[PDB]
Symmetry: C2
Subunit: 121 residues, 2 copies
């Protein structure tokens, strides 16, 4: 008994001194639009930090954190991965932004554009 | 040789089972729109968590964390206070969102409406 294990790479570069986020699938295709979850499963995000600003994941930020779609976020000790876990059958749509620390200053970094997850009914 | 110390309270209630953020000043008056930082100083945010979801600050998130407006962010060990510090003469405009943990689940909570800080030329 099992679900889907999806993978996205979180590519961050510095453009005019500010981070820019480009999301690619495992063979390098730019990700287009919503991620769909049809079953209990995981989405693994791998940080590829090209900024020199020592970026690390500290979590995934949600405006509707009790909406029941993603049920848990998991993070590797070194901040290089964060995973989203859907542990049940709750349908709907949710959005989120990545939250990262940096070693240049003490402000947290946020991805500007919300990622969308659609859990169909 | 000194600056200004501003105080806002972040009042979080649970509306329809998701958090809603109202900001109030020293006098308990609801405020909206931009904060001005017009010389090196501090903005202190107090948490008033009426959600029952054990919110605490873990930091402040910025899409453009290297723009020079806010130079540091401090946080109290109990997550009830965060402060934004301007330590230089950089004029410009920055935006941020509060980043909170909760005790219900492992998703981070974001305030949905970016607060603006304008530091005049
Ligand atoms: Ca779920
Ligand atoms: Ca500054
Ligand atoms: Na808990």
């Amino acid at each position: 008994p099992q679900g889907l294990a999806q993978f996205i790479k979180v590519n961050v570069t510095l453009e005019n001194g500010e981070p820019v986020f480009i999301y690619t699938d495992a063979n390098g295709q730019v990700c287009q639009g919503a991620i769909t979850v049809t079953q209990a499963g995981t989405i693994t995000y791998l940080l590829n930090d090209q900024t020199l600003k020592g970026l690390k994941f500290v979590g995934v930020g949600f405006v509707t954190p009790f909406d029941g779609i993603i049920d848990a976020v998991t993070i590797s000790s070194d901040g290089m991965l964060v995973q989203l876990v859907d542990l049940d059958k709750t349908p709907g749509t949710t959005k989120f932004q990545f939250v990262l620390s940096n070693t240049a200053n003490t402000l947290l970094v946020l991805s500007p554009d919300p990622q969308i997850i659609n859990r169909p009914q």
